[PDB]
Amino acid sequence: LIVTQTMKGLDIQKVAGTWYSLAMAASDISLLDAQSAPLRVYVEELKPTPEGDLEILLQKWENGECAQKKIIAEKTKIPAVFKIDALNENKVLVLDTDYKKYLLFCMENSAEPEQSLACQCLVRTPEVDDEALEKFDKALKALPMHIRLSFNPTQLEEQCHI
């Protein structure tokens, strides 16, 4: 309830498959700081279940190396908002997506909106899409982000992005 944009007419069946966290942003430095920051996570694949939920496979640096984690985003009354009870967040919002190239989503905690917001720009291929980052910044200009990371292709092809 802070992010003012959501996708109208989303079909998660179409966002299935392999993805790359091309860009990340958060309202707090400490959320994305080092490789071991809480919301510093890398999306591998999105798998929507027949029930309408979404299985998210991500990578994160838990201790000594890249640990592949699994999160289950449960559907709600709004097709673009899902409920998770994982990385200190409650909701996952899909802002925009053309299904074939990029997907923009944000994560937040309903209790502490301003201190948890973390958004990403996922892309289908390990390339750098300028059009995507453009849309991502545009959706980002109305939010209080204080840190903003972008990755290069070589990094996109590595577990935990090197």
The DSSP secondary structure of 48-109, one letter per residue, reads: E-TTS-EEEEEEEE-SSSEEEEEEEEEE-SSTTEEE--SSS-SEEEEEEE-SSSEEEEEEE-
Distance CA 52, CA 70 (A): 17
Distance CA 73, CA 75 (A): 7
Single out the residue of 104, 36, 101, 42 nearest to residue 71, CA to CA: 42
- Terminal Cα-to-Cα distance of the chain (whole angstroms): 34
This entry's atomic model was obtained through X-ray
* Strand ordering across the sheet containing 102-108: 17-18, 42-48, 54-61, 66-75, 81-83, 91-97, 102-108, 118-123, 20-26, 147-150
Resolution attained, angstroms: 2.2
Distance CA 61, CA 12 (A): 27
Contact 127, 155 (CB under 8 A): no
130 three-state secondary structure: helix
154 three-state secondary structure: helix
What architecture is domain 1-162? Answer: Beta Barrel (2.40)
Cα Rg for the chain, rounded, in angstroms? Answer: 14
Under DSSP, the state recorded for 19 is -
CA quadruple 62, 162, 91, 108: dihedral positive or negative? positive
Which structure tokens are listed for 22? 């091309």
Distance CA 7, CA 94 (A): 6
In degrees, rounded to 5, the angle at the alpha carbon of residue 23 between the alpha carbons of residues 90 and 33 is 70
The label of the residue with tokens 């997506």 reads: 97
